[PDB]
């Protein structure tokens, strides 16, 4: 470090909206009560929900009731 040519380094409390209490040091100068984190990871639910495009027969079957 070169003696105050870098901005402030404030220890902020990363207080996620659904628990997941954290603690960091960032150049915000202000706290944050933020949304989802890496523990609240919507990486898997949306990963498996990729199976929504495909197939046309299956929609036909319900539409067929005559």
């Amino acid at each position: 470090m070169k003696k105050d040519i870098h901005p402030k380094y404030e220890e902020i409390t990363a207080s996620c909206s659904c628990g997941n209490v954290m603690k960091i040091r960032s150049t915000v100068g202000h706290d944050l009560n933020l949304d989802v984190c890496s523990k609240c990871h919507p990486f898997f639910t949306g990963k498996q929900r990729d199976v929504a495009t495909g197939g046309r027969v299956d929609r036909f079957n319900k539409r067929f009731n005559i």
Binding site: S17, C18, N33, D35, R49, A52, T53
Partner: protein, 114 residues
């Protein structure tokens, strides 16, 4: 003020700032706020942080900004590869809902050319 994609618009009534989401119009906004129980007149900049939580929980039961575009873009891509009449107009940039082509249809084409 953070929702599924982003809530840039504060300073506005809740039934309108919510319409910035790609997937919520003037109608879904009423259903979300009625589901939460937040009075429609509230201004987001004055909404309590315990109620923004309830706001976020709703849009998780409806297809919203992110996956909607992949849902749409694939459907158009599905038809384009199909070679149907609906597909073949998309690949050329022409109206698909049985509109005119003699004089109108500037939205699909663009500015004129001599």
């Amino acid at each position: 003020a953070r929702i599924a994609g982003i809530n840039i618009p504060d300073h506005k009534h809740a039934v309108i700032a919510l319409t910035s989401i790609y997937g919520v119009g003037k109608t879904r906004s009423k259903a979300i706020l009625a589901a939460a129980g937040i009075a429609e007149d509230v201004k987001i900049s004055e909404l309590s942080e315990g109620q923004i939580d309830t706001l976020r929980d709703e849009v998780a039961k409806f297809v919203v900004e992110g996956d909607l575009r992949r849902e749409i873009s694939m459907s158009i891509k599905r038809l384009m590869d199909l070679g149907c009449y609906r597909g073949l107009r998309h690949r050329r940039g022409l109206p698909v809902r049985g509109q005119r082509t003699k004089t109108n249809a500037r939205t699909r084409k663009g500015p004129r050319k001599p």
